[PDB]
Design a protein around this nucleic acid. Structure first.
Ligand SMILES: C[S@@+](CC[C@H](N)C(=O)[O-])C[C@H]1O[C@@H](n2cnc3c(N)ncnc32)[C@H](O)[C@@H]1O
Lengths: 80, 75, 97, 108, 328, 93, 97, 88, 106, 92
DNA sequence: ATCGGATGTATATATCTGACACGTGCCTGGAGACTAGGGAGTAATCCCCTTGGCGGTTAAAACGCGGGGGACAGCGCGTACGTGCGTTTAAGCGGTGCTAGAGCTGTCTACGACCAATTGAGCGGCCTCGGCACCGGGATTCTCGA
DNA sequence: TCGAGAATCCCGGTGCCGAGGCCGCTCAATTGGTCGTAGACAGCTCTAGCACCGCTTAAACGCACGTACGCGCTGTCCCCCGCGTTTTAACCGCCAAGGGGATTACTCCCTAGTCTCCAGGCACGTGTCAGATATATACATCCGAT
């Protein structure tokens, strides 16, 4: 059992992610809203992944199921 | 013996051949010298084009002849 | 000692992270985040590793596009930095809330 | 019996025509798949993959390397604009973004 | 039942006019045509304008028969007086002079209004087919003439002449040896058979010598026209709705053309940024250069937005340069 | 067992457009998914296109109508001007 | 002494008066002449059965309304009240075109 | 006679200025500045051309000349904005 | 025996056999199963009842008895849980929700 | 002789509001809506029938597709009505 | 605008490694020839629907004149955040050890395509009538100058 | 904070045309039989996901400190709204021609299906070289100073 692991996405890593996009100064309140957006997006993808891998009556989320669950939403993912 | 093949660009190419070699060997030698694939080559002399199965001796070609080369598409 | 002006190390980090192509979020926090958020559904999942890496690449390509959009939406207000009322505008114009 | 000569060579193509035919029949896209179709489909797929790979190899040769690595594929897809709208919703793995800084953020 | 007999400046073949005028759109009349002919022939020679300025001006009475009757009856005696003056100590205008651009535009408009009778019937075709019809204006064809300088050893073939004003403008502009225009569907060709006769009569009436031309009827995908395509200099096609099916066959039949030839089309045969490598040798794009013309207005007569025109040229040295530089 | 791919055909068509530059493995997987995705989208559009006219044979015209819908306004001309050159040389043999 | 409202309150009458109703807003017959002029290309004459013209009018009206309802948010974000071209050109770029 | 197909030209002025103002008042703005009335015309011309250039293909494929409402519904379904209320 | 339709054994209101004849000749699989179109008619009937209840509920509150399409528009968008199914649908003769922003009020 | 879903929508309306009828253009809108939902659900069941090397859309693939297309609230009521419908169809 | 210090970035070689070009055995999916049944092509015919034109009435577009509210620029201040530094923590690499579960194979009961016979559920045509748009006339609500 | 006046909801009377219902009537739903096979279930080998442990150190954390910028205020001017007056073409109703959309019948050639034959392409080893890392170094860039 694990709990309170959203603090793994730390402060300078989110700063690096903002650095890749082309921003200059990160204000002191982004470090909560970005964690919120990431939690919503990961919940809304894994709720389509676990159903797909439950339909085959197996218990492993393999990579093809994640590719299909992203192809349903709108951002399709190559490389797999 | 040497013969010449005059193309359109101003370049003259000279090959050394014998009258008994087939035209396929001439096209292979030109392909060796300039890199042009044999299928694209259409050689013309005195208004008559040469056939694949014949030889230079069949057309009464001689020393120091000038031949004309034109380029054609692939198929 | 020598000290740069504030606002120049950032414009070198821009080039250093745009030229590269590595992953950014460290791995073992991300895998624990994915394993913890999947405990809310069917119990005792396993998560074959290539799925975790694929999910990480998707989770990076989401946030990079979101930040590159909210930077435009913050430059529009004649400001330079970003702020919560720019993410909460770009994510509403995009059509997810 | 005649000599067995494959259908890909009869049209001057390179992608396998028979594989495209076996995929259009088994994929339940219609009742009956016509014989004139999968030649055309193999040809369109082969033209699209040649148009991606030419720009990919050009960006690979420009960056002093000889193996095409996926960062070159990202730098060849997004930089042209006629190939962007077909791939407008893909995230290529190990991709990276184009080098791009806005005009305001540069120092005075 | 009376006529409105004019007289020609040089020679004697007076064109006639039946009095109930052919109806046009809500603002165009044949009185405009007759007054415009009189104004252009007054701009032709100034002695007729000197006889025109006194006792009468360009303005009119349109519905009345007697006013236009007086127009013709003064114009005829004016032409007869300068015929008597022309047999004095002066020598006439030289017959071998090609006309200007405005006289040519008015003559082409006059022939196209006089020849075809119900131009709504030209829209009777097969939908989304090669059979479709679309006319090219006078102005872009004049720019086409003034773009490529064609010399005394050329042949102008018009694939898809339509009604055939294109070959008329070409045969009146330059001085080539011969011309050709071929077409399949009979409904424009039956108008073309009268277009020929009316053009010859009117260019005799103005006294302007042209080139030679034969508006032929055929089908250019049969084996008869292959050797005639491959023996010609400049080719005018208009293929905005030909589709890709006959386009590949025209791509094949263009490959046996001579050196220094030219091809124009409303859709480009070879793309503008055509790179060349060891794969696409089978296309005809490897041995031709393309250049976009000037997108000026009034281009076609199916829309109003201008369209480009993509002048080609045949130049077999790009293949020679690429095969020389493969080894470097 | 043996699984299907598009690998060696992509590697064959690379040599005709470049002499001596090979692709790495993770680029081969990317092209192997890209050709599969474009083929899936084209057949999935031509299926519904042959369904709105009550026919049942996806012929060599349905692909030509779906390709001018999927691809944008520049690649469509080259796609059809290569497809016709494929089919015409297929018939006359 | 002639009665005249404050400039800036007839608009907050027209907002409710047009949001309550559901009639068509753009004039019909100039819109039909526009949609026949756009399809005046492709050379072959077309026919435009009238139910398709009205369907196209409903679709081409329900695309400008969402664009203005989003560019109002983009204009309020810059601490202004009116809208301006560099807000429509922001909303169309953030939307993904 | 004169030429066939009496050509419609310069016809973006049908979407006139108070019509675009009414369309704005649907959205919930207050003051429209003096330069929207060109960009809205540009956006509308791009959208109508990008729908008609799919409806004409969908009606070419059946070899008929009438662009029927099913074709507009299908061409809007393929872009992303589906449309009910017309049989599709 | 006596002819009895398949809806009556289902306890449903949408027809069953029409969904079967659509699922076979629409090319969605090769062999269409037996127990599936009953389930499909069930989910379709529950969805249309869930829309029409809110449609009539906002139709009676506006002093009319014919459900005009504006009532359908004001019944889908006013709800929250159905906004993500028709989330990119423009219902014809529709109109927009009554909405003025919080800054524009005088 | 074209089809519609008019008469069954008119039948299911009376089980909620027994004194209100609907107009024609609303009937066409509901007719399109049921058609679109059926198209989406069968089109998702088809693509779910190919990621498992099977070929029969049985009464499980429709349930797994309905738990994906509809959002988080309506899915519970949809599945809890569908399983009741199939367990009533079985015992007959 | 001109100049030095100091730091980072890119440019020029050396080794060493694991991922890539390639050759071989071999299996199964592609090709060749042949036959049977139907979906598509083509021709002829009806008739509904799209265009074209006109004429009257008038809503709505077009145009101009105050003038007030708001876009925009300049200026001053006070917090919040960039940059660097010393202390600190898990990140990560490797290595071992374990086993649940992915994946292939062998049957074969049950389950769904297919077809002839039967008939009622459902669709088009045709009617009746009342819910509803319209109009006009007061009763209530909102805004703006004092 | 109160009066005048424009706008808006409300109430009753009036005509109309689009829903509800009823009736021929036909063709798609339903019953009752076969028969071939996709898939439920058992049983087996073995890939790879998981937990744990130790060592190196790159990176996450707390903090001092200085400064560029977020933000509020004031002032100016400009431009867009409200309203009255004057054009213009939008809209409704009617009338009339004919062309294309749908339909029906009748052929016929393209294409599923079957059997047989064989090489195209895939898994596996095995070599070998493109570049990853490391080191020394010249040029560009930022920052104080003039
Ligand atoms: C776009 S019109 C060009 C008319 C005229 N030359 C012009 O430019 O205005 C194309 C013409 O080509 C003719 N055409 C189309 N297909 C043809 C064919 N297959 N064989 C001969 N003529 C054809 C048509 O009759 C049509 O008149």
């Amino acid at each position: 059992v694990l709990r309170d692991n959203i603090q793994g996405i730390t402060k300078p890593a989110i700063r690096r992610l903002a650095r890749r996009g082309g921003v200059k100064r990160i204000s002191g309140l982004i470090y909560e809203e970005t964690r919120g957006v990431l939690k919503v997006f990961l919940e809304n993808v894994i709720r389509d992944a676990v159903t797909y891998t439950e339909h085959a009556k197996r218990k492993t989320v393999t990579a093809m199921d994640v590719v299909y669950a992203l192809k349903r939403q709108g951002r399709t993912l190559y490389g797999f | 013996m040497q013969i010449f093949v005059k193309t359109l660009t101003g370049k003259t190419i000279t090959l050394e051949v014998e009258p008994s070699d087939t035209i396929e060997n001439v096209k292979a030698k030109i392909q060796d010298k300039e890199g042009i694939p044999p299928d694209q080559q259409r050689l013309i002399f005195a208004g008559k084009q040469l056939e694949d199965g014949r030889t230079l001796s069949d057309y009464n070609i001689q020393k120091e002849s000038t031949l004309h080369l034109v380029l054609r598409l692939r198929g | 000692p020598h000290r740069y002006r504030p606002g120049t190390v950032a414009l070198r980090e821009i080039r250093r992270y745009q030229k590269s192509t590595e992953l950014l979020i460290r791995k073992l926090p991300f895998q624990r985040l994915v394993r913890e958020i999947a405990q809310d559904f069917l119990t005792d999942l396993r998560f074959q590793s290539s799925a975790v890496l694929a999910l990480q690449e998707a989770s990076e390509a989401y946030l990079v596009a979101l930040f590159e959009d909210t930077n435009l939406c913050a430059i529009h207000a004649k400001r330079v930095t970003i702020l919560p009322k720019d993410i909460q505008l770009a994510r509403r114009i995009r059509g997810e809330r | 019996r005649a000599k067995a000569k494959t259908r890909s060579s009869r049209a001057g193509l390179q992608f396998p025509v028979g594989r495209v035919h076996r995929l259009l029949r088994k994929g339940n896209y219609a009742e009956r798949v016509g014989a004139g179709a999968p030649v055309y489909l193999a040809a369109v797929l082969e033209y699209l993959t040649a148009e991606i790979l030419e720009l990919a190899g050009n960006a690979a040769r420009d960056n002093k390397k000889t193996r095409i690595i996926p960062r070159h594929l990202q730098l060849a897809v997004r930089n042209d604009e006629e190939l962007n709208k077909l791939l407008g919703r893909v995230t290529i793995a190990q991709g990276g973004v184009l080098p791009n800084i806005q005009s305001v953020l540069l120092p005075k | 039942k009376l006529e409105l007999r004019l007289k020609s400046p040089v020679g004697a073949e007076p064109a006639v006019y039946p009095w109930p005028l052919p109806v046009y759109d809500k603002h165009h009349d044949a009185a405009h045509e007759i007054i415009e002919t009189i104004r252009w022939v007054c701009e032709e020679i100034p002695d007729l304008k000197l006889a025109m300025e006194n006792y009468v001006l360009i303005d009119y009475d349109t519905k009345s028969f007697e006013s236009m009757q007086r127009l013709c009856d003064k114009y005829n005696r004016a032409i007869d007086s300068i015929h008597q003056l022309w047999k004095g100590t002066t020598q006439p205008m030289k017959l071998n002079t090609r006309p200007s651009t405005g006289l040519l535009r008015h003559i082409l408009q006059q022939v196209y209004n006089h020849s075809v009778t119900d131009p709504e019937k030209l829209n009777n075709y097969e939908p989304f087919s090669p059979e479709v019809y679309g006319e090219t204006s006078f102005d872009l064809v004049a720019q086409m003439i003034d773009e490529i300088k064609m010399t005394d050893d050329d042949l102008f073939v018009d694939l898809g002449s339509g009604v055939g004003q294109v070959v008329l403008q070409v045969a009146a502009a330059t001085n080539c040896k011969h011309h050709y225009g071929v077409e399949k569907a009979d409904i424009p060709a039956k108008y073309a058979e009268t277009m020929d006769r009316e053009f010859r009569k009117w260019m005799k009436w103005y006294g302007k010598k042209h080139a030679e031309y034969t508006l032929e009827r055929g089908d250019f995908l049969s084996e008869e026209w292959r050797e005639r395509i491959a023996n010609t200099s400049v080719i005018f096609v208009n293929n905005f709705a030909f589709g890709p099916e006959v386009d590949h066959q025209l791509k094949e039949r263009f490959a046996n053309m001579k050196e220094g030839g030219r091809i124009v089309s409303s859709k480009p045969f070879a793309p503008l940024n055509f790179r060349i490598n060891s794969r696409n040798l089978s296309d005809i794009g490897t041995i031709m250069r393309v250049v976009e013309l000037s997108p000026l207005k009034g281009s076609v007569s199916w829309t109003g937005k201008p369209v480009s025109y993509y002048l080609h040229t045949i130049d077999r040295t790009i293949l020679e340069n690429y095969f020389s530089s493969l080894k470097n | 067992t043996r699984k299907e791919s598009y690998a060696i055909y992509v590697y064959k068509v690379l040599k005709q457009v470049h002499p001596d530059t090979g692709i790495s493995s993770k680029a081969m997987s990317i092209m192997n998914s890209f050709v599969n995705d474009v083929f899936e989208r084209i057949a999935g559009e031509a299926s519904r296109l042959a369904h709105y006219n009550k026919r049942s044979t996806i012929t060599s015209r349905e692909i030509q109508t779906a390709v001018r819908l999927l691809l944008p306004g520049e690649l469509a001309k080259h796609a059809v001007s290569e497809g016709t050159k494929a089919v015409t040389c297929y018939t006359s043999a």
